[PDB]
Design an enzyme around this catalytic site. Structure first.
Site, PDB file in Angstrom:
ATOM      1  N   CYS A   1     -21.240   0.364  29.280  1.00 51.80           N
ATOM      2  CA  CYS A   1     -20.689   1.201  30.555  1.00 51.80           C
ATOM      3  C   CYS A   1     -21.109   0.788  31.887  1.00 51.80           C
ATOM      4  CB  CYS A   1     -20.579   2.579  30.194  1.00 51.80           C
ATOM      5  SG  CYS A   1     -18.690   3.037  30.275  1.00 51.80           S
TER       6      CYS A   1
ATOM      7  N   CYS B   1     -10.997  -1.416  32.271  1.00 55.11           N
ATOM      8  CA  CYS B   1     -11.731  -0.691  32.963  1.00 55.11           C
ATOM      9  C   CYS B   1     -10.742   0.132  34.818  1.00 55.11           C
ATOM     10  CB  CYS B   1     -13.522  -0.782  32.875  1.00 55.11           C
ATOM     11  SG  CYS B   1     -14.013   0.433  33.421  1.00 55.11           S
TER      12      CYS B   1
END
Ligand SMILES: Cc1cc2nc3c(=O)[nH]c(=O)nc-3n(C[C@H](O)[C@H](O)[C@H](O)COP(=O)(O)OP(=O)(O)OC[C@H]3O[C@@H](n4cnc5c(N)ncnc54)[C@H](O)[C@@H]3O)c2cc1C
Ligand SMILES: Cc1cc2nc3c(=O)[nH]c(=O)nc-3n(C[C@H](O)[C@H](O)[C@H](O)COP(=O)(O)OP(=O)(O)OC[C@H]3O[C@@H](n4cnc5c(N)ncnc54)[C@H](O)[C@@H]3O)c2cc1C
Ligand SMILES: CCCCCCCCCCC1=C(C)C(=O)C(OC)=C(OC)C1=O
Ligand SMILES: CCCCCCCCCCC1=C(C)C(=O)C(OC)=C(OC)C1=O
Ligand SMILES: [Au+]
Ligand SMILES: [Au+]
Ligand SMILES: [Au+]
Ligand SMILES: [Au+]
Ligand SMILES: [Au+]
Ligand SMILES: [Au+]
Ligand SMILES: [S]
Ligand SMILES: [S]
Ligand SMILES: [S]
Ligand SMILES: [S]
Ligand SMILES: [S]
Ligand SMILES: [S]
Lengths: 421, 421
Positions: free
Chosen positions: A163, A359
């Site tokens: 991430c 995202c």
């Protein structure tokens, strides 16, 4: 119980909460749906970086689960699973109580693997975390301590991280907050350390012009950046870093003093799940099929960060590809549909769909977002966008998601992507 | 005829063809559906720039309509409407024949208003067009003439234009083709003239970083660019241009010699439609409501470039906002649904949905695309993307669209945007 099957959902996070509602909605009053989670509150995790710099409070992004799910007929147990016996289909809770299931839906997300880097646990050194609101609050407290006693900043992502977005986000808003306090010039050095092979690789071999844009961003803010790095240990407030080349050879070693730091850790599966024999890969991630069903135990399904997704590339320094919100929801929907089909003597055929990553990073007045699918290039969609409108979207989406977690979802999630009709 | 209503679709283009199929599909064997168009062939217009530089043949992008629609039970008439009497609901064809309708669906697209700029008609000077394959073939022939006898190139968009993308596309591929022929250095000057207030305004106040990217592009190719320009006349192979400032004042006048040129003209409504009293605004664009129904005549609907859409900004030099493919399809679907509802005693409630613009430009190995909605800022989606994958998408979409125009559509068009499921 036969004919009144008991479905248990383990983990009340981004996949887990919606799974609870959807499951109950799908099965109806004839089945018991129980939600089990380590915390008694739900938290919107994409907001944690902002908590970590103090732009948001816990109260802005979290709320107690019980009332909201119980009003839907779901049983809530705020206790972590310590042990799962898949043979007997019993789950042992922290307090020693045990819960039986006919079907298990695992949505436990990640274990933050601080242990990969000795000294890196937020409780044992200056390197903090913004992965959970508890950690982000601690990050902020240390941030304030840096304000009172300025020194070197180090932000980035460890070897094995998956991430990356949020590290970039956090680095930018820190910089941003430092200016708004007229304190930026009091920082001796602001360093960005990443395991990515290049800036804006993002664990997905880059999306659109993320390389160029993230690079420029780190320069605007005066942040020195290093790629192909693994942290080997944190010790005496110093970060020991090794940087490799394309072929894994070492090209240098650095020792970086840290007054304030934040590194995205590698993710592993939580212990209770990883501990189930034959259930998981060596990372502790549940091996499932296209239908989200465990390959070993037919009455165990999984969704979210908890599942394993095979890598498609290998970086000089180990990295993972992220598992993001829309795809997790696809997983959840599929698991719910297929469990329902099982309860009705059919093979559920529904799948997660195409692999994708989406995202959104808010940097304050403007934000960056990306959409990439499928996983391998050349993609069908490979977009990186920046602007005030990305900010406005993140804000709107959080407002929406949190509302839905309280009202309940049925709910073929993502009629949000229907702002056309 | 009563109970067996006759629906006529005027114009077999991007909206018209799908409208024909959809209409027939919706009404069934109990109603007559007639398609009337000026050409006997369908053409994929987004491909015309490529024809204009010789990267595509007519045969690659066009095909005869008759067989394909008749196999669906639609009547085809390859004749242009010269006149529409809305009172008597009769349409007079070029050959003097007349056709009656119970419902009229107007999809005539644009009249290319060369007359706004004396001398600019492709038949009366060096300034060509790529708006239709007939014109694009002529553009290419002139392009070859430039190859044999090199001189100054001028490409851009006239005052009042609403389709800017393709001018940028054409300028880039020309440049591109000039290099691949090792002929670029034989060009004395390559100038880009636009009515946009700035590069990459695109008639939509810019999308993402189109300003920065299109600007850079024109520099890579060595193309000198001027904004806020109106061409006043073309004469003796010279383009007379006036450039204004933010306040419409004149800041300069230029005379540009042109050996080879291509300017996107302003669009007006076609004469037969503009000629219908009270039907259209002064541009000749059909005034319709949210449901695509004429505001004057309840049995006349419209879709595509033919309809009027109110402006939301005003540029120093007059410009229009583009009407693009996905939105046109939304218009078509709505018109079909609401006509059907009329035939069944209901008010059709379906609408076009949210205003949006989507455009794909292929420059050869890579392409640019954008998505913007809604029309005013701040938008919900404001994206500009560039890459090899945009190229791959344009290619795939054309392959798809042309196939569908032959197989027929039913067909809630755009299950293309379902490459997730
Ligand atoms: C900082 C941050 C920013 C992110 N940004 C985005 C973003 O912008 N967009 C996007 O799409 N994705 C985002 N993600 C990625 C992803 O969407 C989130 O990580 C998401 O929360 C994962 O959902 P999950 O359901 O798999 O896990 P989680 O949300 O972590 O939920 C797991 C739940 O299980 C519980 N649990 C764990 N172990 C046990 C146990 N033993 N017993 C009982 N309960 C247990 C936990 O308390 C938790 O409630 C972000 C990730 C992070 C960390
Ligand atoms: C060069 C070019 C590139 C474009 N690129 C894109 C793109 O990338 N993506 C996108 O979404 N949009 C694109 N567009 C914009 C838009 O999608 C097209 O212009 C589209 O073809 C408009 O569809 P339409 O049905 O309104 O008109 P048209 O496709 O022009 O069809 C109108 C039809 O009516 C017929 N007709 C006209 N007058 C009469 C009459 N009097 N009697 C009978 N028939 C008549 C014509 O022969 C024609 O067949 C492009 C436009 C152009 C010109
Ligand atoms: C091509 C697919 C596009 C879908 C995404 C558009 C709108 C929603 C953004 C994605 C998202 C999801 C799904 C999501 O669940 C989530 O929370 C964890 C986000 O964080 C803010 C997200 O940004
Ligand atoms: C948010 C909406 C996204 C829809 C667009 C994605 C896929 C199709 C591209 C749009 C398009 C349409 C609809 C279209 O009809 C068309 O032909 C005229 C194009 O030219 C190639 C197009 O690019
Ligand atoms: Au994290
Ligand atoms: Au992530
Ligand atoms: Au992740
Ligand atoms: Au044109
Ligand atoms: Au256009
Ligand atoms: Au247009
Ligand atoms: S990410
Ligand atoms: S992940
Ligand atoms: S992310
Ligand atoms: S355009
Ligand atoms: S247009
Ligand atoms: S366009």
């Amino acid at each position: 119980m036969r004919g009144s099957a008991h479905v248990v959902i383990l983990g009340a996070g981004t996949g887990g909460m919606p799974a609870a509602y959807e499951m109950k909605e799908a099965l109806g009053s004839g089945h018991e749906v129980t939600l089990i989670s380590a915390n008694d509150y739900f938290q919107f995790v994409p907001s944690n970086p902002w908590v970590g710099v103090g732009w948001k409070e816990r109260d802005d992004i979290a709320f107690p689960i019980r009332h909201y799910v119980e009003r839907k007929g779901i049983h809530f147990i705020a206790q972590s699973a310590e042990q799962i016996d898949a043979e007997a289909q019993n789950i042992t809770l922290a307090d020693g109580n045990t819960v039986h299931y006919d079907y298990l839906m695992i949505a436990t997300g990640p274990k933050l693997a601080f242990e990969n880097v000795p000294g890196s646990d937020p409780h044992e050194g200056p390197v903090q975390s913004i992965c959970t609101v508890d950690h982000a609050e601690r990050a902020f407290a240390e941030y304030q301590a840096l304000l009172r006693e300025p020194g070197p900043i180090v932000i980035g992502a460890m070897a094995g991280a998956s991430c990356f977005g949020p590290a970039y986000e956090y680095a930018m808003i820190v910089a941003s907050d430092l200016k708004k306090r007229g304190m930026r010039d009091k920082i001796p050095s602001f360093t960005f350390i990443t395991s990515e092979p290049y800036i804006g690789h993002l664990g997905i071999q880059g999306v659109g012009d993320s390389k160029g844009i993230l690079t420029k961003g780190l320069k605007e803010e005066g942040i020195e950046a290093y790629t192909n790095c693994k942290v080997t240990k944190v010790e005496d407030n110093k970060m020991y870093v090794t940087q490799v080349d394309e072929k894994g050879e070492t090209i240098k070693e650095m020792v970086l003093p840290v007054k304030f730091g934040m590194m995205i850790p590698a993710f592993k599966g939580v212990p209770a799940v990883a501990g189930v024999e034959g259930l998981c890969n060596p990372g502790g991630f549940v091996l499932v099929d296209e239908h989200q069903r465990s390959k070993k135990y037919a009455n165990i399904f999984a969704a979210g960060i908890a599942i394993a997704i095979p890598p498609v590339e290998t970086t000089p320094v180990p990295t993972g590809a992220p598992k993001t919100g829309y795809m997790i929801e696809s997983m959840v929907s599929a698991a719910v549909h297929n469990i329902k089909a099982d309860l009705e003597g059919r093979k559920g055929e529904q799948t997660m769909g195409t692999w994708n990553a989406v995202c959104f990073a808010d940097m304050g007045d403007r934000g960056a977002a990306f959409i990439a699918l499928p996983q391998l290039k050349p993609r069908k969609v490979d977009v990186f966008a920046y602007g005030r409108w990305v900010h406005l979207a993140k804000v709107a989406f959080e407002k929406y998601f949190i509302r839905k977690m309280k009202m309940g979802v049925s709910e073929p999630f993502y009629e949000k992507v229907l702002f056309k009709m």
